[PDB]
Amino acid sequence: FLDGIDKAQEECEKYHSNWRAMASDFNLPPVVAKEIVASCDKCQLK
Ligand SMILES: [Cd+2]
Structure with a gap:
C-alpha cells in the first residue's frame, strides 16, 4: 500500500x-492495480 x-x-x-x-x-501486485481500476468509474463499468 x-x-x-x-x-x-x-x-x-x-x-x-x-x-x-x-x-x-x-x-x-495485481491486488492494488486492480483495486485502482475498481475505483475508477470509467474502467469499472464496460
Ligand atoms: Cd481509469
Missing part, C-alpha cells in the same frame, strides 16, 4: 484498461 497509489489514479486514464503496465511502473 504505497501513497504513490493516489498518483496512479491520476494517470489511470493514461494506462487505460492496461493495469498490468501500471503495476509494472509502480511494481505493485
Whole structure:
C-alpha cells in the first residue's frame, strides 16, 4: 500500500484498461492495480 497509489489514479486514464503496465511502473501486485481500476468509474463499468 504505497501513497504513490493516489498518483496512479491520476494517470489511470493514461494506462487505460492496461493495469498490468501500471503495476509494472509502480511494481505493485495485481491486488492494488486492480483495486485502482475498481475505483475508477470509467474502467469499472464496460
Ligand atoms: Cd481509469
